[PDB]
């Protein structure tokens, strides 16, 4: 749970793939829709994420993205330590599952406002990050990182 | 120079369009490559930005994106006040031009490491945001927003 730790997570809807990165200490997320999970898509997403937040370590979502030399090349480029995503703490499995279920719930709630799934997913990212549970995940991530810079 | 104010900026390279959002107070940026600058592209980009940072006001980059009902709909959805980008302070034109020149310089410096321009642009976003000029823009934006929350 340090300021620079993120977890990748890949979930499926409408025959498409939603790739999510989770900042583990705050639960803030960034996500995108891609037609399938490849090392090249995953690598590009990580390059995007690391330009926007100070990404120190990423726990990859599966062994294909851990092995992928393209993902390792992007983590080299961006200065990220690529790690496995083994739930040594069994709580991690459950936390990710129920986030996927929350996001899919939200996507359902908005899905009728968007023609394309990618709009719905970005509406869901906005609702997740602004939800007060008291602070939101977007507030918690800035607090944590600012505390670290100081 | 409030924590929530952003400026849109659109520049061209390689026959393609790079859309950039600038957090005015810090100089932090987010950017993407699109084939052309339509209201639907600009609206989706603002929906992405506002799910990731607390975007209160956007100064649009031109009068077509100010007029566009699709951009107004995204700003309504995401709770953003859409404003014009008139440089009442003439310092503004100059700052934006100098940023586009800096990004294009960076993109040149990386361009041969990437097959696709979108990779190069995200490398340039990462270098711009991490550059110490002393704090980086990525550090300044987190400090500013954390100060505002507190």
């Amino acid at each position: 749970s340090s300021p620079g730790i993120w977890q990748l997570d890949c979930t499926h809807l409408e025959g498409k793939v939603i790739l999510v990165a989770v900042h583990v200490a705050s639960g803030y997320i960034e996500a995108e829709v891609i037609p399938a999970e490849t090392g090249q898509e995953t690598a590009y997403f990580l390059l995007k994420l690391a330009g926007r937040w100070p990404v120190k370590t990423v726990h990859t979502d599966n062994g294909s993205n851990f092995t992928s030399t393209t993902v390792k090349a992007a983590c080299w480029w961006a200065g990220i330590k690529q790690e496995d995503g083994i739930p040594y703490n069994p709580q991690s499995q459950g936390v990710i599952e129920s986030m996927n279920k929350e996001l899919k719930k939200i996507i359902g709630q908005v899905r009728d406002q968007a023609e394309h799934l990618k709009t719905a997913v970005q509406m869901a990212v906005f609702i997740h990050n602004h939800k007060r549970k008291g602070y939101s995940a977007g507030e918690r991530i800035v607090d944590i990182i600012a505390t670290d810079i100081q | 120079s409030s924590p929530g104010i952003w400026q849109l900026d659109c520049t061209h390279l390689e026959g393609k369009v790079i859309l950039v959002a600038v957090h005015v107070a810090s100089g932090y940026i987010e950017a993407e490559v699109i084939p052309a600058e339509t209201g639907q592209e600009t609206a989706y980009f603002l929906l992405k930005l506002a799910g990731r940072w607390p975007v209160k006001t956007v100064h649009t980059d031109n009068g077509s994106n100010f007029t566009s009902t699709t951009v107004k709909a995204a700003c309504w959805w995401a709770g953003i006040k859409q404003e014009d980008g008139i440089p009442y302070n003439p310092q503004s034109q100059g700052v934006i031009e100098s940023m586009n020149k800096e990004l294009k310089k960076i993109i040149g410096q990386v361009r041969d490491q990437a097959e696709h321009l979108k990779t190069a642009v995200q490398m340039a976003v990462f270098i711009h945001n991490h550059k110490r000029k002393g704090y980086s823009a990525g550090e300044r934006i987190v400090d500013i927003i954390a100060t505002d929350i507190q």
């Binding site: 090249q40 690598a43 390059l47 393209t70 090349a73 | 490491q113 990437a114 097959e115 696709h116 990779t119």
Partner: peptide
């Protein structure tokens, strides 16, 4: 291709 986004 000897590029970060296309290692071939």
């Amino acid at each position: 291709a000897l590029k970060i986004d296309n290692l071939d």
